[model samples]
Every structure is written in C-alpha cells, then in structure tokens.
Target chain A: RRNGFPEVIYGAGKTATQIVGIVQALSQQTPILTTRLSAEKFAALQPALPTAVYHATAQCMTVGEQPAPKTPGYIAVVTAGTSDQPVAEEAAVTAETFGNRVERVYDVGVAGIHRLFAKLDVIRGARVVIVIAGMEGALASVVGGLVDKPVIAVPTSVGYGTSFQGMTALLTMLNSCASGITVVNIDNGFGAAYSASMVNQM
Target chain B: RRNGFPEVIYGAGKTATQIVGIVQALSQQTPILTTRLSAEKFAALQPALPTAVYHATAQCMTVGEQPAPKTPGYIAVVTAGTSDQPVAEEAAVTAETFGNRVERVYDVGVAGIHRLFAKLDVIRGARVVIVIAGMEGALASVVGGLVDKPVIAVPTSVGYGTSFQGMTALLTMLNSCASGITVVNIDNGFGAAYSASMVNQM
Candidate 1:
C-alpha cells in the first residue's frame, strides 16, 4: 500500500503458503524479507521457494539477493553478551539487506568492561553504531561514551530476575547517563538497523 | 509483593472497590498513586475515599499530598503543543510527587522555533529536562542540543497520519542526533519523570 517504503512481512499471522504467495508477489518488483519466521516455517517454505535464504539466528527469510554495500563507512553492531547475538544478527542482517556495510563486535559486555575497550577501534570507525544488550543495558552507555558516531541501542529480552524481560535494560538504556545515544523498542533489531541504514546513507 | 519497590496501581483490570481497597492498603504505609484511572472511576471511588486527588489530564489519582521539593534545582517539563500538556502534567505531577521541583515550558514547538528560544533560561536552569512531543519529536533534540543537563524524552500520542499513534515521534526521538539525551516509551511520562527524579535526587 505504501509508495516507496520497503516491503516487509511479519511472520506471525500468515501461514507458509500465505508467506510464499506474498513473497512471490513482492519479489517480482524488488527483494523482500520476512521476520520472526520460525525454523519450522522456513523448512515448510523450502519446497515452494528453495532459493530463498533463511538466517536462523536472525529468524528472518529473504527471497532475493541482498544489495551490495552502498555507503562508505560501516555500521558497528556491538553486543553485550552471547545471548544478545540473535538481536545483533537481526540488526546486522537488516543493515546488510539495506546495502550498508556492518562491522560486528560481539560478546563485549560491561560485566567485563575491558572486553569493550579492546574493540574501541572497530566500534569507533563506523558511520553509526548499534549497541545490543540485556540485563540493565549498560553497554549502550559505554559505547555511546566512547564513540563519536550516532548510536542506536537495542535492548534484547535476554536476562532474568530484575532484568524484567529487558524492561530493566529498556529503562536503563532510556535513562543512560552517556550522551549521543538513541534507542529502539526492546528486541527491535530491525527497527534500529532500519534507522541506522537511513543515517548511514545520509 | 516487592520489599523496597514503591507500589503503583494500574487503572485496568480492577473494580472501583478493588482500587479503593488496594489504595486503602498501600496508603496506610505511605502515599499512593494510581495511573490511567478514569474520571468515572474516580467519581465512583469518591464515595468510599473522598480525599483522593484526581489529575484529569494526566488520568492519575493520588491518595496523599505531594511531598515537598527536596532537590536544589528543578526538573524542566517542556512540551510541544497544547495536546502534549496531559503527558507533560503526568511527568510534572510524578516528579512533584517524588519531591522534586519542576519548571514547565509548555506549547513551544519547532514549528515556531522562536517561542522555544524565549524560554531557554527556564529550560536550561533545570537539573534535568523532560522533552515531551508527538509530531516528529524534534523538540527533545532541540532542547538536548541547547541544554547542558540530561534530557529525558517522552513521545506523546498526539498527531495524525504518518504519526502512527506516536510511533513516528518515538522513532524520531530514538533517532535524534542530539547528545546527552535518552528516551522512554511512547506516552510514558511517569517513567521519564521517575528516572529524572532519580537523577535529580542523586
């Protein structure tokens, strides 16, 4: 229904055949991707659309070849922990799919602050940075404090106890003391990457 | 159920008597507040607990008097439009209830930038700033750009089309290029003020 907006399909409501039909329709004009698609759903989609690529960690399915990187500097996708990788991968894949280069610095959490400092060079080199974390989401603040680039924080639902299913991280990021950082919804990797792609191309 | 956490009541899922009883229980320990309560419900509650205060625009009820300001500098509650006042009041009232002084700079949007400039002294004088906006949410960025204090952005549900019930403003705030700013959930004035109170008191 939108004119220039990129086509994206949500995986919750539709069935495998429904997804295949929609993908088939959208792909004729341009490349398309579906998010939150289950592994079982992707397997179900294979017989009809064997050529499509499915990123398991990201839980996304792409029906067309991704565009080549068009911007000069890359987007740094930094994560707080191994558990945050799925959201990080979603941000990375989304950025890549949008034709932006991405440099990933994973498993660098504030629980061990030195892990983050060791990778400052890669994080600081990007046009934009996406910080993904859970359990109080302090990584975004640390990265924001270090980087001169625009930072987009993603709070993953990856922690327990007072973490409150990322609400704590969401609030932590929202109330981050560091400067120059903005945030997307909790676990909204695609939104962060989408906004980052816009800023990167700008 | 929380030991140290302050008890808050949500307006949904409970009857007037239930709210009255819960407020009755919590108020016995300390001052209590309820959010998202309706005029009808408040009216219904008056027969049982006649002293409770109802802030119409904020849709909140208070069973006890607001605490006196305990902080030196105040929190600035800045808004973009007339409609944004409700959310601003929510933040203002919440901040006041938490014992922080608040300075309001209302109805100064970027559509007319000069109006905002006129109130710079008041906005900048605060210990922290809460920028409330609905359309594009550029006010937060502008305030963030001007003020040296920490900025807490609240995206209100105040515009039509492309606004996506404040999602656009939420994204705009999330993607704001300004420094020293963080954002809360869409229309989450209470959360922003709660965080700001913590900072101001600290």
Candidate 2:
C-alpha cells in the first residue's frame, strides 16, 4: 500500500534515546524517516530498533516499510558534482520513503556538459526533477530548461566564504533564467523531496 | 557624463576616514557610492566630502552627479511593507545611481491586496520590477504571476527565528510556481538593483 509519507524525526539536536523513543511511537501509525542523523547515533539506535536501517551517505534512518510508488513516471534526482551526492541521496531517500521511485543521474554538471547530455534520457523520463548543486543554480537552470518537468533545486554548502555556505548557490538557483524552476532551503533535501513528491503525485 | 554605476566602497568594516579616503580617490575617476555606511561615519565624512550627500534611510553616501536614465520604461521598485522601505531605498538609490528611472510603489502587500491592485498600473508599466518583501516570497510570487515583465525579488531579514532571517522568504521565491521569477540574496537590495538594471536595459 502507498503509506504516503513517513513521520519525520530530525536527528540534529535530539539524543539517540529521544530518537528511539519517538521512532518507537511513530512506527505504530506510519513509516518513520529521520534525517541529518549521525552514524554514531544510528549505531546506538540499532539495538533498540532492529528493523531500522541507516543510510550513511544520505545521513538518514528508515524505520518500518518503505512506501510503494503509485505512478510509473518516477522522480529524477540529479547531482552536478560528486560533492552533491549526499544531498542527492537525501532527496532520493526522501522520495523513496515518501512512496515514489527515484532515477538518480549523478556527476552530470556542465563542467563536462557531455556527461549531462549522456544522462538526458533518464532525466527527461521522470515526472519531476531535482537538481542538487554546490557551485550554484547553473546546473539547475540547464536541467530546468531542458526538461519540461517541474524542476526543484537543492543548493548544497560546498565552498568557502565566496560561497557564503551555500547562500551563493541558493541565490543563483533563485535567479535562474529557466522559468518555473522552484527551490528549497539550502541543503534541504527533504523539503525538495516533499515538493517533488507533490508534483510527481499529480 | 553617464557614470553607469559608482565606484564601490562598503562602509560596514571601513572607518569614516577610510571611506573618505576611498571616496576621494574614487571621485577622481568616477562617481562615488558607499553602502552600509552609518550616520556617525557620514557626519564625520561630510567635512572632507563637501560635495557628497548622505541618504540616511538608504544607509548610503553619494558623491558626483546621479546618472541620467537613457530610457523611459523606468524600473519599478515596490515594497510590501513599511519595514521594507529601507531595503527599497537602497534598491532605489542603486537603480538611480546606476542610471535607471524608478517608479516607487510602497505598502501594497497582500495584507491589503487592493493596495497592490490600486498600484498595478505603475507596477505593470515597468521595464523590470523589484518586489521587496519580508514575509517571504508570497508577495513577489503574486506580483510575478500578474506582471509579464521581469520580476526581481529581494527577501529582507524582517522577522524572528521562524523567518530564518529572510531565508524563508528567499526559499519561497525560489520555489515559487509562478515561473521565471528570479531572486537575489537576503537583504541584498544592492544585488537586486544590479540584476534589474541589466534586465531593464534590455
């Protein structure tokens, strides 16, 4: 059954015990998805919740069954750089966790251009697209322009002061010439997934 | 002569004397403009810079003649709230200094949608529109949807933690369904003006 989306558990400020307690309660009603979780905390949480699995790259945890997609037009998650994969993974997991399939197109930034071109078919096939980049929205603009699908951009904190800890990328995405290309908070994979899921469902 | 834009001098970190020194040198070559300057610094700087004028609300200093607009289509600078005026002033000053005519539209947020509707003629008339709002991009999205002209949105740091110091508004604009509406950095009226000038010139 399409369980819809999981109940949220942000692991940043909470303790492992608190997460375990919350996850214990949440799984009874719906699947549980925890983001920004640390491996150390997950290790601590594993014994108490044996069924849950840790996604190290995505920095997330899953409790209960992952949801099944209701549509064939899956969500496409693309990353401009290798540094962007974590955010991409988080979006992919969030999409999957929220009952949608994700076709990941990795390392397709304009730096090569051809790399992105090679992955165009997979990207264009999806109902919606999520572009994760650190340098800025240049990648998202290209993707948004190319694909007719709804484009959601996730700006990662990848550079130094010039990047303003992803602020630069966030602004770049906001100002993309590609029309209707929407964006979420910096490094907000979960938020992008939430939006893409909505668009994909339609 | 049309200066195009002034030579840069950010007064946040620089002292009054430093600004005066920079202005003295810059005015020798072109018009001088300093932003994020304080009244205390400007008062002190005035003695040395007799020709310069201080725009208190804009928090900027001007030396040399303001540029003349080359076209009449004029840039529109609109504010959603009273609190947004300061940012609007900065944007207006920037637009004027960079040689673009400005049509000021103030206090027309959706809080009173009629106020915005009343001023729709002025807004719709612009070559490019700058929508300054603190409550997030809702105001900008509305304007973007109605106007065919390029809409440059500026998210001001106008609220408490929930606003995330303009991050919330910034993301809202980025993710707007309106399509093609671009955004600048938070409280970045200067940046918005720069982008608007390019679009307006077109």
Candidate 3:
C-alpha cells in the first residue's frame, strides 16, 4: 500500500544489522537508497543484500531498480572541484537509481571559469542541475545563473581552515542571489538527487 | 603582542561574564568582535566595557572602533526578506566596523523580484556583496549572477517545516549556478562581513 517514493535509509547513525533488516523487508516491495554507509558497515550489509549496488564515491548503496516514470527529464550532476567528485557522484547515482537519466560535468570550478563554459551546452540541456562544491562554494551560483531550470546545490565537507567543515559553503549557497534555486545539507548528495528526481519526473 | 586580525568570540556557548573576561584582555591589544550575543548578554557586558556597541539586528557586539583603512571599497549587504534583517545587519555592521562603506538593500526577495531590481544600481556599485536569505535562499545566486565581484553568502534559520532549520536554504545557496562566490555559516553575518571587508579593503 506504499504509493510514495521508496524509503531511504541514512546509514551513518544506524548499525549494519539494522540496515540489513530494513533493506530485507523494504527491498521486496520497492527500491531502496541508503546513504553515508561506512566501509565496514557496507561490508556487513553486502552479504544480506547481495544484489545491492555499492557506490563507493557516494558512500551509498542501492537495492533494486526504481520504476521509470513516463516522462523523465535529464538530471545534470555538476562538481566544482576534484574534491567534490564523491558528493557529485552520490547525486548522480541517486538520480540513476530513481530511473532518471544523468549527465556529469566534473572538476569545473570558478578558479578556472573557462572550464565550466566548455560544458555550458551540456549543462543547460538538463532539466535539473545539482551543483556540488566545497571551499568558497561559488559553483552553485554560477550554474544557477546559466540554466533557466531548477538547481539543487550540495555543499561538501571539503577544504581546510576557514572552510569550517562545509559550513562556509553551505552558507554561501543559502545566501545565493539566483531566484528559485534549492539546496540540500552538507554532503547530502542522496537528498539532492532525490529532490532532482522529483523535479525530473515532473 | 598580537598581530593580524583579532580573534572572534562566538558568544552563543559562552557566558556574558566569560566574554567580558576574554574581551578585557583582547580589546586592550586590538579591536574585538563577538558574534551571536543576546541583548541580555550585551547589556551585562556593557558595564564592563563602556565603549562597546551592540548591533541588535545582527545579535553582535563590537568592543571598539576598528581602524579605518586609508582607502576602502563598498560592501553591499542585501537581504531576501524582512525576517532576514538580523543576519543582513550582521554582515552590514561587520563591514562597517572594518572601515568599509556599506549599502543595505533589505526585504527584497524572489517572491517579489522587482523589489530587488529597484536597488540594482546600489548593489552593482559594491566591490563585494554579502547576500543573506532564508527559506528558498535564492538571493545569493541571483546577486552572484548580477554582480561580477566576489559574493559572500549567509543563510539564516528563519523558516518552518522542510526548511529543516535553515538546511534547505543552506543547500539552495550552496548549489547556486553562479561562479566566484563565497559562503559563510548559518546566521554568520559577522563572517560574511569580515570576508567582504577583506575583499573591499583589497
């Protein structure tokens, strides 16, 4: 009787056995998305859900394939720097699991604006864009300005010193001037993708 | 004996008397900045430091006037909604303390985009911008798109439900599409202004 989107499990706070038990029950009914799974916890959950796909970069795992919507639009997952790849991949993997098509544009940060311009056409083509970044986190604003669509920003726990473990980037994105942009929590790639999927299906 | 920027005291977790003790020592050497102080706390500290100025909107207090730089650039502090005034004021006050001229454009959100457009001339004149927003938190990106200068974004905890105590706005700003932008932490007007002052003085 569950007609809503499949349940997602945040793996950071739960034990491996708890995750396994939840997946065992939920996977039978619908696909599952579990994010922030630790290597050790994932190792334990692997045997329980043999078919679950592990996304190392995203630190997430998926059980079963999501049902495709009738008219799914493309999701573009973009990253600001090399350090942001894992978070970007998390969004990408999450979008893919939700049965939406995904395109990736990686390591194109504001320090070198030309690199991003090179991928402008590919990025603008997306129905939704998820911009992932750390440090100054200027990428989300840059992407939002170019594409006339929804942008989901994800701030990663990257950078050093005053980066304040992603709080700086998180605030930067929140204070963005672009109209109608959305944001997820620090390193919440799964949430970004989940929201993007919702937008894509529309 | 101290050099460089003065150390900032985060007053949320500290007692008013404790802040006085810290400031009594630091202010003797350099101007002191204390953020997130309640009116009650500032009141309690005022007797000990007669020269301190309390910025109610920003919930911050400065112990002494910061030395004016010979030449300073403009810093524009913009807000999305009226509720965001406290955070916006924090950035504005902080920039002013560092001897940089500040311009304020308040309560002009995307819901009423034209209000923001009316202040375009003032905003575009700044050397640095500090955009503050809550809720959807799209203001930072919008400004980033409009201005070519460095932008420092600050998110406020001023919404209900899915805003997740400012996480939604934080994510929205982080995922902005604009380039060459910077971000601070939640309600971190002081940090945003400090960074803007650096950009302005440069």
Candidate 4:
C-alpha cells in the first residue's frame, strides 16, 4: 500500500512500536527510508526488521537494497569538517538509494583551502555536488565558485552560539557569492541528496 | 537612530499590541522590519508608528529608511510568474532596505523563455541575482545557466496539489541543473534579498 515515492518514516515523532507496524506493511513491496531515527529506537525495532540496514553516520535505516543505477554521472558529497560527515553521509546514502553513484571529499573546510584544492578533480567531475558544512558554511560558496556543476549545500547544527543552531551557515549558503549553489534546511542531508539525485538523472 | 542591521519582527506570532511595544522600543535606535504582516494588523499598528511604510506586495512593513548604498553593484530580482510577485517584491524591498540597488523582472517564467531572454542583459549586469518562482521552479536553473553572477532562488508557495505548498518548487530549485544557484526557504523573499544584499556589498 505504498505510493510511487519511497515509504519514508520520519522517525523523530514516531515510536518504535509505530515504526515496526509501518515497516511490516511497507517493507515487502517497497524500499524504506527512516530518517532522524535514534539509536535506542533502532535497537528496539531491529529485531522485528532483521534485514534492515542502519547507517549510523546518517542516523537513517533502510529496509531493502536500492535498485540498480539507471542514470549516468556521479554526485559528489563534500564535507567542510569531520563533524559534518553525518550529514554528508546522509546525502551520499540517499543519492545512492536513488540509484546514483556518489563520490565523497571529507574534511576540506575553508581554514585549509588547500585540502579542497587537492580534491578539485573529484568534486568537479561529478554532475552534481552536495556541500555539507557548519559554522560559517563557507564551503558551499567556495565549491560553487570553483565548479560549473549544481551545488546543494546542507548546513549542519555543529557550531557555537553565533551559528544559531545552523542558521548562520544556512544564511551563509543562501547568500553564497558563487554561482550554481542551492540550500536545504538545517541537517537536511536527505533533502539535499534527493535533489541531487533528481538533477543527476537529468 | 538606526543600527546598521534591520531589527526584524516576525509578525506571525506576535499580537498587534505586542508588536507596537517592540517597535516603540526598537525604532528609537534601529529600523524595524516586520515580515508576514497582514493588512489588518498593519492598519491596527499604523497609528502607533506613523512613519512605518507598508509594502502590500511583500506583506511586510518597514519603520525607517535604509542607509545609502555603499557598494558599487546592484541586485537583480527575477520572477517566473505573476503569482510569485509577492515573494519577489519581498526580496527586492529587503535588498533595497539594506541599501542595495535592485532591478526587477517579473512574469517571465520558462513557459515563455523568450520573455526571460529579453531581460538577459539587465539580469546579467547585476552583481547578484535573486530568482523567484513557484510550481516547477525551473526558472532558477534557466537563469543560472545564462548568468555567471551569484543567484539566490526563492521558491514561493504559489501552486496547487503536487506543488505541496512550494516544496516541489523548493526541491526543484535545490536540484537546479544549472550551476551558480542557491535557495532559501519557501516564500522566504526577505532571506533571499538579505543574502543578495550581502553579496552586492561584497
């Protein structure tokens, strides 16, 4: 009884029992994406869905394997720092689920622009790029400035008071000086990757 | 008696009397920006702040004039459809409030790509571009493809059913196929223009 899109379980507001019920109904016919799931909840529901695969870094769980890739070109997911890996991985996993090959460039923030320079080829070669960052979120602008590809920037809640729980980075990315950059909500890696997958298909 | 940045008043949750009090306190030292304000509410508070300027198109109000432009460049705001004018005007007014010159090109969606093509020179001449749209939100991608300047795409809640109150447009803009585009939240013209002002200043 699932729709054309994936049966998504927004786990934040749902209980383990509720998730189990939804999973039981949808797991047979469709691949599932349960995002923002907590560790305790996952443990409680793991037994019921033995085939479920959990992506710890993404805080997400999937019920089935993704279909084979049907599109050409790859998606590049770049993180500004190690703290951003969670969101970056979320984007990568989501893109892969939508059947797109994803490349990753981690911990290449603006503090050491040289780190990004080293991975320029990898980031540029992709048809689409997902830039994950916190703090000032300058990575999106930098990547957008350098590449001719679309850039989906995900701002994470990983900084101090001025960061305003990722609003600063969100605003920064929204106001990026570089061309070809777009943004999603705070910690919304799945949304960024979903958009990237759509573009890669084009 | 205005500060450098606008003292924003999110008019949604606040009562008219409460907004009056906040404005009375802040207007002495800074310009006030009230967003998501309704005409009824604005009329109720108009007596309290005689100098307040209401922008009906943007559904926003300002209490004081912005400073003169300190930057050499202007911001270009382009809208895909007539219904997107409200959000588009919000971006224009916000950018102008921050002392950035703005050029507006409305009702030139992809359905008539020729309309947009006609304004290419004016749009590309700006230091920053803010593309506003609803429905499929393909305008950002089209404009991004044509211009090298930084683009801030604002998705308006102006479509039915599948538009999901702008989520569809937001997703499309986020996944723009062209390079050099960034996005703000649905109907977030103020945020888009604010970012555009920053880039124009830079």
Top candidate, metric lDDT: 4
DockQ of 4: 0.01
Cα lDDT tens digits for candidate 4, B1-202? 2335677765864678888898988666745788878999999988988889999988889888777777777889999999999888878888888888888999999999999999999999999999999999999999998899999898887879988788888889899735988888788888888778878887
Candidate 2 ranges with C-alpha deviation above 4 Å: A1-3, B1-202
Model 4 clash count equals: 7
True contacts kept of each: 0.00, 0.00, 0.00, 0.00
lDDT of 3 by residue, A123-168 (tens): 8898888899999988888888888888989988888998878888
Model 1 iRMS (Å) reads 11.8
Q: Pick the candidate with the highest TM-score.
A: 2
Deviation in Å, model 1, residue A145 alpha carbon: 1.0
Per-residue CA lDDT of model 1 for A1-202, tens digit only, reads 4432356775754678889888887666856877778898999989899888999999988888888887778999999999999888888988888889999999999999999899999988899999999987888888888889899999888868877677788888888645898988778888899999999998
lDDT of 4 by residue, A1-202 (tens): 4323566678899999999899888656757888888889899988888888998878889888876777767999999987788878878888887788988899999987999999999999999999999988999999998999898999998754245579989999999844988899999999998888888987
TM-score of 2: 0.52
Give, for candidate 1 chain B, the lowest lDDT window spanning 10 residues: B1-10
What are the per-model C-alpha RMSD values against the true structure?
A: 14.5, 14.2, 15.9, 15.2
Tens digits of per-residue lDDT for model 1 on B1-202? 4432345687767888899889877766855778778888999998788888999888888888777887788999999977788888888988887889999999899977999999998988899999999867888888888989999999998654236679888898988645888999999999999999999987
Residue A48 displacement in candidate 3 (angstroms): 2.4
TM-scores for candidates 1 onward, in order: 0.51, 0.52, 0.50, 0.51
Off by over 4 Å in 1: A1-6, B1-202
Q: In candidate 1, residue A103 scores what lDDT?
A: 94
